[PDB]
Amino acid sequence: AVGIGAVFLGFLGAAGSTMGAASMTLTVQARNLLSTVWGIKQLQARVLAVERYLRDQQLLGIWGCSGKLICCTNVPWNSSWSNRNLSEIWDNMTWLQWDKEISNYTQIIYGLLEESQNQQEKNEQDLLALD
Amino acid sequence: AVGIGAVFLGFLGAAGSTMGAASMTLTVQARNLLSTVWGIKQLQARVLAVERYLRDQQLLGIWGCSGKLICCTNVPWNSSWSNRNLSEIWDNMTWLQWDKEISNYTQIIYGLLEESQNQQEKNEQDLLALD
Amino acid sequence: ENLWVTVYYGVPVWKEAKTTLFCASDARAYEKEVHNVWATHACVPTDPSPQELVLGNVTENFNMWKNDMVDQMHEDIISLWDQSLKPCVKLTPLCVTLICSDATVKTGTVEEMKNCSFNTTTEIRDKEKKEYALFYKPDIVPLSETNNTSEYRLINCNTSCVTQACPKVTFEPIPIHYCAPAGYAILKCNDETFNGTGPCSNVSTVQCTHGIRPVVSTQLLLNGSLAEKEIVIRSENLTNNAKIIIVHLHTPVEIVCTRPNNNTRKSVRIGPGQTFYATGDIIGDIKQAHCNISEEKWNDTLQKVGIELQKHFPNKTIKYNQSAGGDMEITTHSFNCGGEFFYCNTSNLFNGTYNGTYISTNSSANSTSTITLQCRIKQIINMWQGVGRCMYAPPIAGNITCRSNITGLLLTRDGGTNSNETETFRPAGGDMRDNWRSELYKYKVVKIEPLGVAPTRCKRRV
Amino acid sequence: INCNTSCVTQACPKVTFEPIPIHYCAPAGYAILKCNDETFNGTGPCSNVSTV
Amino acid sequence: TVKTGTVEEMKNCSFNTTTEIRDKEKKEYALFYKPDIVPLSETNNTSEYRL
Ligand SMILES: *[C@@H]1O[C@H](CO)[C@@H](O[C@@H]2O[C@H](CO)[C@@H](O[C@@H]3O[C@H](CO)[C@@H](O)[C@H](O)[C@@H]3O)[C@H](O)[C@H]2NC(C)=O)[C@H](O)[C@H]1NC(C)=O
Ligand SMILES: *[C@@H]1O[C@H](CO)[C@@H](O[C@@H]2O[C@H](CO)[C@@H](O[C@@H]3O[C@H](CO)[C@@H](O)[C@H](O)[C@@H]3O)[C@H](O)[C@H]2NC(C)=O)[C@H](O)[C@H]1NC(C)=O
Ligand SMILES: *[C@@H]1O[C@H](CO)[C@@H](O[C@@H]2O[C@H](CO)[C@@H](O)[C@H](O)[C@H]2NC(C)=O)[C@H](O)[C@H]1NC(C)=O
Ligand SMILES: *[C@@H]1O[C@H](CO)[C@@H](O[C@@H]2O[C@H](CO)[C@@H](O)[C@H](O)[C@H]2NC(C)=O)[C@H](O)[C@H]1NC(C)=O
Ligand SMILES: *[C@@H]1O[C@H](CO)[C@@H](O[C@@H]2O[C@H](CO)[C@@H](O)[C@H](O)[C@H]2NC(C)=O)[C@H](O)[C@H]1NC(C)=O
Ligand SMILES: *[C@@H]1O[C@H](CO)[C@@H](O[C@@H]2O[C@H](CO)[C@@H](O)[C@H](O)[C@H]2NC(C)=O)[C@H](O)[C@H]1NC(C)=O
Ligand SMILES: *[C@@H]1O[C@H](CO)[C@@H](O[C@@H]2O[C@H](CO)[C@@H](O)[C@H](O)[C@H]2NC(C)=O)[C@H](O)[C@H]1NC(C)=O
Ligand SMILES: *[C@@H]1O[C@H](CO)[C@@H](O[C@@H]2O[C@H](CO)[C@@H](O)[C@H](O)[C@H]2NC(C)=O)[C@H](O)[C@H]1NC(C)=O
Ligand SMILES: *[C@@H]1O[C@H](CO)[C@@H](O)[C@H](O)[C@H]1NC(C)=O
Ligand SMILES: *[C@@H]1O[C@H](CO)[C@@H](O)[C@H](O)[C@H]1NC(C)=O
Ligand SMILES: *[C@@H]1O[C@H](CO)[C@@H](O)[C@H](O)[C@H]1NC(C)=O
Ligand SMILES: *[C@@H]1O[C@H](CO)[C@@H](O)[C@H](O)[C@H]1NC(C)=O
Ligand SMILES: *[C@@H]1O[C@H](CO)[C@@H](O)[C@H](O)[C@H]1NC(C)=O
Ligand SMILES: *[C@@H]1O[C@H](CO)[C@@H](O)[C@H](O)[C@H]1NC(C)=O
Ligand SMILES: *[C@@H]1O[C@H](CO)[C@@H](O)[C@H](O)[C@H]1NC(C)=O
Ligand SMILES: *[C@@H]1O[C@H](CO)[C@@H](O)[C@H](O)[C@H]1NC(C)=O
Ligand SMILES: *[C@@H]1O[C@H](CO)[C@@H](O)[C@H](O)[C@H]1NC(C)=O
Ligand SMILES: *[C@@H]1O[C@H](CO)[C@@H](O)[C@H](O)[C@H]1NC(C)=O
Ligand SMILES: *[C@@H]1O[C@H](CO)[C@@H](O)[C@H](O)[C@H]1NC(C)=O
């Protein structure tokens, strides 16, 4: 998923391919997010573009992850959201239509991830105080 | 490279010394980056100062590093850029004139670092799925 | 085996949203004088590149008449027009009772202008002085309680705002690029058979769009983009009578307009240095005020319109009648060239029919036969409702010409009935939005949602 | 004399144009350099360079 | 004065204004409340008032 190399097109260069086929190239893709009275609209665009970026970063930083590309966690997947085969979704669907199916339960997942993060940090403190 | 202690001068307090002699003190040095119609220019300066900082942070975050001070990687150094002795450059030159020699091949190095990062993350996934 | 949840950063998902755009222009337009044109003082240079990127598969649903970008252009152009007249203001007379007589010239007389004796203030607010200037007949109204043919008043003063444009600005339609800030992307539908809405499939992505020309225009559209291969006819309801239909032509048909010589622009100063210009005498003889259009190009172009329009209609005929009356701002075609404004009458263009019996006119035995139209020249412009549409235009130095490459038509169908198998089209005007909507239908802007979640067998090591 | 052109405006009787000293600071990300060489002859290699 | 009697708290004041054309003045009238008009005069001239 890295054979393009010459990437100046952002995430949009992989659209339409399978989700498995886009597991890489996320480096350059992410980079494209940041690179008279008229000055008021010209300025406002720059400030809100930053505000969007940081809030997305908070979501990753809140529940304990770095290495923005891919973050796995320990919360088990509740099959009641899809009841579908993994390989069928992962190889047949691209990111486009996948979003339109999981976009209803996003808030549920965010909550569980936050709870899990607190459980782990405290667990570390007990194991730290042993040494 | 840490004997100053009283650092309220930023990076500029170490200029002229050898690159080896400035390997530390980067903590306080980095801190100095962030600490009517006239309001328009007064505001614009603050927003562009932030925009400069984050894009530099992206470059570090894109190819997988934290601990902003010093980041070593696994890409081998291609001697065709310098063909010079390490100790000669590292002890005789300060950062000033060093930049003026390596500033031509910066884009090449950034590309290789990005490719290396993707290779490592995927390698982890295979070794993760073994356990 | 078991499944857990993984979050991904960098996922290509698009969503619809409203935002603003970036104004930019080519570098050769920024080394000129300030406000010559407004882009020089207003926008930022950019690169017309990168390379348009075509997507693997994807399916998208554009809609010409559901797009905020078009209204945004309208707001920007109206806003900048008002801002351009703030540092260039006149408040002085030009409203005093004007005494007038039949306009005469060194070689004869003229019927379309009047020579009007004035009553103004000198540079010192103690004295009035005598003066004269010439004006076009349609911009002066005989304000009187009776038939007093010696008491006239400048048409515009019924309300206000007689302001004057600067003699150092030009309204040449410099092309404008629309870019989007980071976090968004622009999509372009390349399907030339695209019939207004629904599943585009050749969808390319762009970071910054193509050139567009801010031309003010009515029924006949002047410089612009070209069609790909053949005539394209867009429409909304068709059935319904109150809608406007867009006809995109694969011509272009040559058209040229001109006017005769004038002597100069008298420089008159009122009070504290408020210089203004007015049309003075005219040398030598006096003529029109006309536009020329090649006949043989017009003929087959107007016929080709029939062969494509008949795609939606079974066995019904196309007819062409004059516009629904009203004053000149509605029926007559208005456009700008070289700082002058013309209002032309198009009777000789839209008279005829098409019944399916297509007749190609051959051979090109005589290309000299052309069509000719009459025009008028105003000076009070009432362009846009809410922009301070009150500009008093100055005249310019001598005889000027204008050559244009006419690309499309704005038509509307008459609301006829009683076995109307001879459906007729009238010329109709409309908001400038409709012209820019015809130029800007290819482009849409969406939001990037870079975060996504998917199931996987991966798990975090404790 | 002034009315040949315009703008006869009048200054306020509550303002003064005393040259109050002004400081020039730079926002973060930049720095100011000051050349202390009193024999500095307009251009070229300063060596007593301080930072501000 | 009013069609049915008079009023003590207002005055009817004859005006001297400019027409829509800056060449002529015209006659007009409006009514005002007593406390918003002051008799600007050097003497007891009850026929010269100012807003
Ligand atoms: C383009 O050139 C062609 C040459 O064929 C024109 O064809 C001529 O068009 C006129 C006007 O449509 C025709 O005369 C008319 O005949 C109809 C009845 O069929 C009648 O109702 C009208 O009053 C008029 O007399 C004419 O017969 C036809 N042929 C020639 C040689 O004149 C065509 O009209 C031109 N473009 C336009 C505007 O149609
Ligand atoms: C002022 O008025 C004169 C008269 O309308 C205009 O001069 C004329 O310009 C037109 C357009 O150039 C001439 O037609 C063409 O001339 C070109 C010249 O190279 C020739 O290449 C063409 O095939 C055709 O002959 C027209 O004959 C000409 N007359 C003269 C005396 O040259 C002029 O354009 C007007 N505009 C200004 C601002 O001067
Ligand atoms: C427009 O009317 C004015 C008013 O008469 C004319 O101005 C006078 O022209 C005559 C002859 O050219 C001179 O004797 C006068 O001295 C002019 N008056 C002033 C105030 O200069 C003018 O000629 C007319 N112009 C046109 C084109 O009709
Ligand atoms: C001032 O404005 C009024 C309208 O706001 C104009 O009055 C009309 O005059 C036109 C012809 O000029 C007539 O067709 C209309 O019937 C009249 N009334 C209306 C409703 O417009 C008037 O012409 C304007 N001109 C002045 C008074 O200088
Ligand atoms: C463009 O094509 C679409 C279909 O892709 C046309 O949609 C029509 O929509 C009306 C709404 O009731 C339907 O009743 C028609 O049946 C649709 N067409 C078909 C074949 O189903 C749309 O009109 C076309 N646009 C134009 C104006 O050409
Ligand atoms: C108005 O301005 C003009 C110049 O813009 C002045 O005209 C000159 O007057 C001076 C003396 O006052 C002469 O030396 C010049 O030769 C005249 N012409 C020029 C080119 O300046 C005029 O004085 C000004 N004063 C007025 C008219 O009130
Ligand atoms: C300041 O010193 C510099 C040299 O440090 C002078 O530079 C001169 O530049 C011209 C350009 O052709 C040379 O030809 C001279 O030979 C230079 N001087 C020497 C000694 O080489 C510069 O002029 C001095 N500035 C002033 C104006 O004092
Ligand atoms: C206010 O004073 C004016 C001035 O006389 C009155 O206006 C006149 O009223 C009379 C009778 O109503 C008319 O004959 C005149 O034609 C009016 N003058 C004008 C210029 O129209 C007015 O009636 C007074 N109004 C009040 C309420 O006192
Ligand atoms: C369209 O989908 C197919 C599925 O195999 C894919 O192979 C093809 O590469 C996609 N589009 C393009 C042109 O890549
Ligand atoms: C016109 O202006 C002149 C300047 O002399 C002034 O005398 C005159 O009264 C004004 N109107 C008439 C009546 O000419
Ligand atoms: C899509 O558009 C591009 C634009 O050049 C075109 O070249 C291509 O042919 C179109 N798609 C197909 C199916 O070829
Ligand atoms: C069309 O382009 C031409 C060619 O330069 C320019 O002359 C003309 O002004 C533009 N047309 C209009 C509407 O002015
Ligand atoms: C306009 O078009 C829509 C779609 O065909 C149709 O439903 C509607 O009936 C048309 N207008 C009217 C008022 O019929
Ligand atoms: C346009 O409508 C008028 C109404 O009388 C009609 O007389 C005329 O013939 C129509 N069509 C043409 C050919 O002008
Ligand atoms: C328009 O032109 C035609 C041809 O000169 C003429 O018959 C008609 O009176 C003109 N006026 C309008 C506004 O129709
Ligand atoms: C309309 O077309 C006919 C074709 O003969 C032409 O005679 C007439 O001048 C044109 N104008 C009118 C009034 O129809
Ligand atoms: C008009 O179309 C022709 C076709 O060759 C083109 O060469 C010319 O540039 C166009 N003129 C303008 C000014 O658009
Ligand atoms: C450099 O400038 C400082 C300013 O006080 C001065 O004290 C010092 O003497 C100068 N450098 C040298 C060589 O002393
Ligand atoms: C009031 O206005 C009128 C309008 O005729 C004017 O004639 C008059 O002199 C002004 N003052 C007086 C004295 O009425």
UniProtKB/TrEMBL annotation, chains A, B:
The chain crosses the membrane at residues 1-24. Residues 100-131 form a coiled coil. Residues 41-59 are annotated as: Immunosuppression. It is a single-pass type I membrane protein. Residues 1-21 are annotated as: Fusion peptide. Glycans are attached at residues 78, 85, 92, 104. Disulfide bonds join 65-71. It is found in: Virion membrane; Host cell membrane; Host endosome membrane. This is Transmembrane protein gp41. It comes from Human immunodeficiency virus type 1 (HIV-1). The gene is env.
TrEMBL record, chain C:
Disulfide bonds join 23-43, 88-166, 95-157, 100-116, 179-208, 189-200, 257-291, 337-402, 344-375. Glycans are attached at residues 57, 107, 115, 119, 158, 195, 202, 223, 237, 299, 315, 321, 345, 351, 355, 399, 405. GO terms for biological process: clathrin-dependent endocytosis of virus by host cell; fusion of virus membrane with host endosome membrane; fusion of virus membrane with host plasma membrane; positive regulation of plasma membrane raft polarization; positive regulation of receptor clustering; symbiont-mediated perturbation of host defense response; viral protein processing; virion attachment to host cell. It comes from the Viruses. Its main location: host cell. Residues 323-333 are annotated as: CD4-binding loop. It is a peripheral membrane protein; Single-pass type I membrane protein. Residues 418-428 are annotated as: V5. Keywords: Apoptosis, Clathrin-mediated endocytosis of virus by host, Cleavage on pair of basic residues, Coiled coil, Disulfide bond, Fusion of virus membrane with host endosomal membrane, Fusion of virus membrane with host membrane, Glycoprotein, Host cell membrane, Host endosome, Host membrane, Host-virus interaction, Lipoprotein, Membrane, Palmitate, Signal, Transmembrane, Transmembrane helix, Viral attachment to host cell, Viral envelope protein, Viral immunoevasion, Viral penetration into host cytoplasm, Virion, Virus endocytosis by host, Virus entry into host cell. Palmitoylation of the transmembrane protein and of Env polyprotein (prior to its proteolytic cleavage) is essential for their association with host cell membrane lipid rafts. Palmitoylation is therefore required for envelope trafficking to classical lipid rafts, but not for viral replication. Highly glycosylated by host. The high number of glycan on the protein is reffered to as 'glycan shield' because it contributes to hide protein sequence from adaptive immune system.
Automatic annotation (TrEMBL), chain D:
Palmitoylation of the transmembrane protein and of Env polyprotein (prior to its proteolytic cleavage) is essential for their association with host cell membrane lipid rafts. Palmitoylation is therefore required for envelope trafficking to classical lipid rafts, but not for viral replication. It is found in: Host cell membrane; Host endosome membrane; Virion membrane. Glycans are attached at residues 4, 41, 48. Disulfide bonds join 35-46. Belongs to the HIV-1 env protein family. The CD4-binding region is targeted by the antibody b12. The mature envelope protein (Env) consists of a homotrimer of non-covalently associated gp120-gp41 heterodimers. The resulting complex protrudes from the virus surface as a spike. There seems to be as few as 10 spikes on the average virion. Surface protein gp120 interacts with host CD4, CCR5 and CXCR4. Gp120 also interacts with the C-type lectins CD209/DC-SIGN and CLEC4M/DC-SIGNR (collectively referred to as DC-SIGN(R)). Gp120 and gp41 interact with GalCer. Transmembrane protein gp41: Acts as a class I viral fusion protein. Under the current model, the protein has at least 3 conformational states: pre-fusion native state, pre-hairpin intermediate state, and post-fusion hairpin state. During fusion of viral and target intracellular membranes, the coiled coil regions (heptad repeats) assume a trimer-of-hairpins structure, positioning the fusion peptide in close proximity to the C-terminal region of the ectodomain. The formation of this structure appears to drive apposition and subsequent fusion of viral and target cell membranes. This is Envelope glycoprotein gp160.
